[PDB]
Chains A and B, each alone.
With several copies, the nearest count.
Chain A
Amino acid sequence: PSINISFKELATTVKERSARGIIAMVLKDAKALGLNEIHEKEDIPVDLSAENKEYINLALMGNVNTPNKLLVYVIEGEADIQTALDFLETKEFNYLCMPKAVEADKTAIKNWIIKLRDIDKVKVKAVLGKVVGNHEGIINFTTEDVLVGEKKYSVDEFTSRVAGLIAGTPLSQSVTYTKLSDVVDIPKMTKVDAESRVNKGELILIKEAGAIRIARGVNSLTELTAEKGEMFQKIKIVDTLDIIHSDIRKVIIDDYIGKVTNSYDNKCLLIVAIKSYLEELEKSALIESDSTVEIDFEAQKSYLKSKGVDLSYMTLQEIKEANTGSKVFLKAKIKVLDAMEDIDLSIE
């Protein structure tokens, strides 16, 4: 007999964010020995050391925006790599940095990252000081004797600072020619040496346009295969590709596995949803406005050959109409619309 008006507010977001702006921080301290997720600025645990506090402060600010999420884990230096790997497996991350990453530790980190990206299909990135590895997911910042604010800084400190800055870098903007006001004193380098270092695939600081900025934003991978091409030599392209991969995988796991069945109508609905997501991406300047979603027809051919059904005496549309045995095959045409850093025009 007693009834009430129960109204619960609803908020709609046109843009959905997933696995973006994450910073993974692991430091070796004997006092805290735990994980700390920092969502509010100037949140400093008393356990962490002064150098760790400096690392946190460097990670605090970004070029355009403060990084969305800062996650810090603390454990003893001994057996740090195993626990760091376990925790990063437990909780997803976007970028990784280590204050005291030795060459063996950096190699192990790169191997774990590439193994994840190649088997687990988890698109993750790491920033490292001196690594010559053959993967584009890692970031190599080889700039020695770096001093910021008339203060001596180690290589790993500035790599963490640059990772935090990139976390705050918007996708429309490019990391190329981004000046740092805090950096005041750097060893003098020649233009030829800087160009040679950049052509080696290294990220360095240059004094240009009356400021100290980085020359380029290329990936740490020196050797890109024939298929990868020039654009895959840029972190900007791989970033949006990884974001699209993560979003598609997340929505697929949320909706289509288990909950949804396999049918031609289900295939059409999945195609429509993929097209809608691609249109949402097209709303941003990240990708081109033109893209297509199609059923992988040759994959259906291969599935029929595995089944053994003769290809003759039916319409080619029946191949699409034929059930794929709890499977879906799709084809999509996309192109990354990442614009231009430096240009060259002509006069008459």
Chain B
Amino acid sequence: LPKTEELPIFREVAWDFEKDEPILEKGDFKIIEKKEALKVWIYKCIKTNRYEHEIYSLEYGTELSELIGQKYTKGLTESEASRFIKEALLINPYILEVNVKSANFNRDILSANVKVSTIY
């Protein structure tokens, strides 16, 4: 009968995702609220695999870096990477679902469009 309790706003440090270095506002890390914490969490999860570092929990980590280095053809690894991203990102309770649109083949650089569904 009682309704589900809403997840409280996730607050933590902030920085520019392109800078990859923490930023300080007059000595205070920038506050992240609403759709600010989930981007940081996804960036942290995707950027580094757990199996490289013993400290992280086993559920953490992604296996997209296995596809790095051209270990298999693109045709099936497109769907394989979609599934890998889905496994790596839906572990977060905040995130509801993740959708992958397609992949673009050009030279050696692969570009893909992936979608994120959130609560707030």
Residues of A participating in the B interface, judged by any CB pair closer than 8 Å: 3-9, 11, 172-174, 176-178
Closest Cβ neighbor of B62 among chain A residues:
A5
Q: Which residues of A contact B39 (CB under 8 A)?
A: 9
- In contact, B46 and A7 (Cβ under 8 angstroms): yes
- In contact, A9 and B64 (Cβ under 8 angstroms): no
A178 to B68, CA, bound (A): 10
Q: Say yes or no for B17: interface residue by CB 8 A criterion.
A: yes
- In contact, B73 and A5 (Cβ under 8 angstroms): no
Q: Which residues of B contact A176 (CB under 8 A)?
A: 69-70
Q: Say yes or no for B105: interface residue by CB 8 A criterion.
A: no
- In contact, B70 and A5 (Cβ under 8 angstroms): no
Closest Cβ neighbor of B64 among chain A residues:
A5
- In contact, A173 and B71 (Cβ under 8 angstroms): yes
A173 to B69, CA, bound (A): 8
Select B70's contact among A8, A9, A11, A174, beta carbons within 8 Å. Answer: A174
- Contact string against A for B residues 55-96, beta-carbon threshold 8 Å, 1 for contact and 0 otherwise: 000000000100011111100000000000000000000000
Q: Say yes or no for B103: interface residue by CB 8 A criterion.
A: no
Q: Say yes or no for B24: interface residue by CB 8 A criterion.
A: no
- Contact string against A for B residues 24-45, beta-carbon threshold 8 Å, 1 for contact and 0 otherwise: 0000000000010001001100
Which 6 pairs across A and B sit closest by C-beta, in order of nearness?
A177-B69, A174-B70, A176-B69, A9-B39, A177-B68, A174-B69
A176 to B69, CA, bound (A): 5
A172 to B29, CA, bound (A): 41
Closest Cβ neighbor of B109 among chain A residues:
A3
A185 to B11, CA, bound (A): 42
Q: Which residues of B contact A6 (CB under 8 A)?
A: 17-18
Residues of B participating in the A interface, judged by any CB pair closer than 8 Å: 17-18, 35, 39, 42-43, 46-47, 64, 68-73, 109, 114, 116
- In contact, A7 and B114 (Cβ under 8 angstroms): yes
Most chain B CB within a 10 A radius of its CB, from A3, A4, A5? A5
Select B116's contact among A3, A9, A174, A178, beta carbons within 8 Å. Answer: A9
Closest Cβ neighbor of A174 among chain B residues:
B70
Q: Which residues of B contact A9 (CB under 8 A)?
A: 35, 39, 116
A164 to B109, CA, bound (A): 29
Q: Given A7-B46, A172-B73, A176-B70, 12 other A-B contacts at CB below 8 A?
A: A3-B68, A3-B109, A5-B47, A7-B42, A7-B114, A9-B35, A9-B39, A9-B116, A11-B35, A172-B72, A173-B70, A178-B69
The smallest beta-carbon distance between B62 and chain A, in angstroms, is: 10
Q: Which residues of B contact A174 (CB under 8 A)?
A: 69-71
Question: Would you list 24 pairs from A and B whose C-beta atoms are within 8 A, ordered by A residue?
Answer: A3-B68, A3-B109, A5-B64, A6-B17, A6-B18, A7-B42, A7-B43, A7-B46, A7-B114, A8-B17, A9-B35, A9-B116, A11-B35, A172-B72, A172-B73, A173-B70, A174-B69, A174-B70, A174-B71, A176-B69, A176-B70, A177-B68, A177-B69, A178-B69
A173 to B116, CA, bound (A): 32
Q: Which residues of A contact B70 (CB under 8 A)?
A: 173-174, 176
The smallest beta-carbon distance between A13 and chain B, in angstroms, is: 13
Closest Cβ neighbor of B71 among chain A residues:
A173
Closest Cβ neighbor of B38 among chain A residues:
A9
A173 to B70, CA, bound (A): 6
Q: Which residues of A contact B46 (CB under 8 A)?
A: 5, 7
A172 to B116, CA, bound (A): 32
Closest Cβ neighbor of A11 among chain B residues:
B35
Closest Cβ neighbor of B72 among chain A residues:
A172
Closest Cβ neighbor of A177 among chain B residues:
B69
Q: Which residues of A contact B114 (CB under 8 A)?
A: 7
A172 to B18, CA, bound (A): 33
Q: Which residues of A contact B35 (CB under 8 A)?
A: 9, 11
Q: Which residues of B contact A7 (CB under 8 A)?
A: 42-43, 46, 114
Closest Cβ neighbor of A173 among chain B residues:
B71
Closest Cβ neighbor of A178 among chain B residues:
B69
A178 to B109, CA, bound (A): 19
Q: Which residues of B contact A172 (CB under 8 A)?
A: 72-73
Q: Which residues of A contact B17 (CB under 8 A)?
A: 6, 8
